[PDB]
């Protein structure tokens, strides 16, 4: 066969140890999920690090400790109009309960009359997005280093019945050691089987989302294929100026590859960017192992990645604890707090 | 031709 006896036994024992790890991780997650911390004038606002329709994130400095954090600020009334109440409650609750080296850590959450706040570890290296657009594309080893972290993170999340639903370079921060921190859990959800919400980011949507099917966690594996393609090409596989045209290309499903893609990479991507759910990697009997044991990952030491012992291909320059040089500049908007409480009943559980 | 800037999420189609 492909593996000699010793290699086969090493890989089997490895896969059994993954099972043992995931069983304990689920114990810990459920305990925190069942039995889960600050206020605004505890922080100085420094700089907006990102902003979109579903909220904004600010660098803040904790007054007592001087530690820097990334504070997500959500407008309650805006969340209600956009029908994101449950999504925002999911984001806080999931972030509180998970624990993995490539998931950003939540430190505090609170609310006031107008807003909801989630205070996370500040990741100063910036978004993968910026670094990718600046350099153009990543070489295959560089892309593979990041991809491996996402594979492990999705193995972890999916074992807990959590779907992520917004993979994209914009949501992947680079930490001081060059490793990934996944941010923005606003579409994450605990899903045993099917779910139906039309959400995500157009270029990364699986066809079954666009086609309004009741879909499952395999949409995350499709999105991994989009991410790996974009990292290695510099642009995503279904690329067009407007969402309707992007959707048309996704549903047709015909992917074309740059001539510099290796055959191993193209084979992996054809099996992730697979319309037929009975054939899509990550959705088969062999589960995540179809991905981890693929030829394109043959040089990947999965334990060494998890342990953060692989030398990263890129170490961001770090000019100090509150340095923001790896982020772009955004128009700064006030943090307004009404004298009157808004949407108290909607957010009682937050 | 396609979108090279940061991409917003959608909440519906
Ligand atoms: C509304 C943009 C939010 N962002 C993610 C998408 N780009 S973000 O501003 O990059 C950011 C979010 C969460 C934690 C962070 C920790 N450290 C730095 C930034 C962080």
Cβ-defined contact of A247 to B13 (cutoff 8 Å): yes
Backbone φ and ψ of A71, nearest 5°: -105, 115
Residue A126 Ramachandran class (φ > 0 left, ψ -120 to 50 alpha, else beta): left
- Cβ partners under 8 Å of residue A323, min gap 6: A124
> How is residue B10 annotated by DSSP?
B
- Atom 9 of ligand 1: nearest residue by CA position: A50
Which of A125, A152, A105 is CA-nearest to residue A304?
A: A152
Can you read off the two tokens belonging to residue A156?
Answer: 């972890």
- The gap between the terminal CA atoms of chain B, to the nearest Å, is 22
Question: Dmax over Cα atoms in chain A, in whole Å?
Answer: 71
Contact B9 A83 (CB under 8 A): no
**What secondary structure, in 3-state letters, does chain A show?**
CCCCHHHHHHHHHHHHHHHHHHHHHHHHHHHHHHCCCCCHHHEEEEEEEEEECCEEEEEEEECCCCCEEEEEEEEHHHHHHCCCHHHHHHHHHHHHHCCCCCECCEEEEEECCCEEEEEEECCCCCEHHHHHHHHCCCCHHHHHHHHHHHHHHHHHHHHCCEECCCCCHHHEEECCCCCEEECCCCCCEECCCCECCCCECHHHCCHHHHCCCCECCHHHHHHHHHHHHHHHHCCCCCCCCCHHHHHHHHHHCCCCCCCCCCHHHHHHHHHHCCCCCCCCCCCCCCCCHHHHCCHHHCCCCHHHHHCCCCCCCCCCCCCCCCCCCCCCCCCCCCCCCCCCCCCCCCCCCC
Confirm whether A323 is a catalytic residue: no
d(CA A221, CA A279): 12
User: Are A243 and B10 a contacting pair at CB < 8 A?
Assistant: yes
Q: Show the tokens assigned to A72.
A: 């997500």
With b for 16 or more beta-carbon neighbours within 10 A and e for fewer, the A174-210 pattern comes to bbeebbbbbbbbbbbbbbeeebebebbbbbbbbbbbb
Neighbours of A114 (CB within 10 A): 20
Residues in Cβ contact with A40 at an 8 Å cutoff, skipping those fewer than 6 apart = A110, A112, A117, A335, A337
* Gyration radius of chain A over CA positions: 20
- Find the helix packing angle between A218-233 and A140-159, rounded to 10°: 170
Pick from A207, A205, A198: which is nearest to A253 by CA?
Answer: A207
Chain length of chain B: 13
Residue A36: CB atoms within 10 Å: 10
Q: Is the dihedral of CA A267, A209, A133, A60 positive or negative?
A: negative
Cα of A171 vs centre of ligand 1, distance in Å, is: 7
Placement of tokens 């044991």 in the chain: A293
Model resolution, angstroms = 1.6
Distance between CA atoms of residues A214 and A193, nearest Å: 9
Question: How many A×B Cβ pairs under 8 Å?
Answer: 55
Quick check: A121 and A70 in contact, CB under 8 A? Answer: yes
C-alpha A264/C-alpha A272 separation (Å) is: 13
Distance of CA A332 to the CA centre of its chain: 25
In DSSP terms, A173 is beta-bridged to A127, A181
A26 alpha carbon to ligand 1 midpoint, in Å?
A: 26
Q: Which residues pair with A174 in a beta bridge?
A: A180
**Which tokens go with A161?**
């019945």
Strands A55-62, A68-75: pairing is antiparallel
Please check if A214 is assigned to a binding site. no
State how far the Cα of A234 lies from the Cα of A97, in Å rounded to an integer.
34
CA nearest neighbour of A72 among A125, A34, A110, A41: A110
Nearest CA to ligand 1 atom 5: A171
- Under a CB-based contact definition with an 8 Å cutoff, are residues A335 and A115 in contact? yes
DSSP state of B7: -
């Amino acid at each position: 066969g492909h593996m000699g006896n010793a290699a086969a036994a090493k890989k089997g024992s490895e896969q059994e140890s993954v099972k043992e790890f995931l069983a304990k991780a689920k114990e810990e997650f459920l305990k925190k999920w069942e039995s889960p911390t600050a206020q605004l004038d505890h922080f100085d606002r420094i700089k907006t690090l990102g902003t979109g329709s579903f909220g904004r994130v600010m660098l803040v400095k904790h007054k007592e400790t001087g530690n820097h954090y990334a504070m997500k600020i959500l407008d309650k009334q805006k969340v209600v109009k956009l029908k994101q109440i449950e999504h925002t409650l999911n984001e806080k609750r999931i972030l509180q309960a998970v624990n993995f080296p490539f998931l950003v850590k939540l430190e505090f959450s609170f609310k006031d009359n107008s807003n909801l706040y989630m205070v996370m570890e500040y990741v100063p290296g910036g978004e993968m997005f910026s670094h990718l657009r600046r350099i153009g594309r990543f070489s295959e080893p560089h892309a593979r280093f990041y991809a491996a972290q996402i594979v492990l993170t999705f193995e972890y999340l999916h074992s807990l019945d959590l779907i992520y639903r917004d993979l994209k370079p914009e949501n992947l921060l680079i930490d001081q050691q060059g490793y990934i921190q996944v941010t923005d859990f606003g579409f994450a959800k605990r899903v045993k089987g099917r779910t139906w919400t039309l959400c995500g980011t157009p270029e990364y949507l699986a066809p079954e989302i666009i086609l309004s099917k009741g879909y499952n966690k395999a949409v995350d594996w499709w999105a991994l294929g989009v991410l790996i393609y974009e990292m290695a090409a510099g642009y995503p596989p279904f690329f067009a100026d407007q969402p309707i045209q992007i959707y048309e290309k996704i549903v047709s499903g015909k992917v074309r590859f740059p001539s510099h893609f290796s055959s191993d990479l193209k084979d992996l991507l054809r099996n992730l960017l697979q319309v037929d759910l009975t054939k899509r990697f990550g959705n088969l009997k062999n589960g995540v192992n179809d991905i981890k044991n693929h030829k394109w990952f043959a040089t990947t030491d999965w334990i060494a990645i998890y342990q953060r012992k692989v030398e990263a291909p890129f170490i961001p320059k770090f000019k100090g604890p509150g340095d923001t040089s790896n982020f772009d500049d955004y128009e700064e908007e006030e943090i307004r707090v009404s004298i009157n409480e808004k949407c108290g009943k909607e957010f009682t559980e937050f | 031709a396609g979108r090279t800037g940061r991409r917003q999420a959608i909440h519906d189609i």
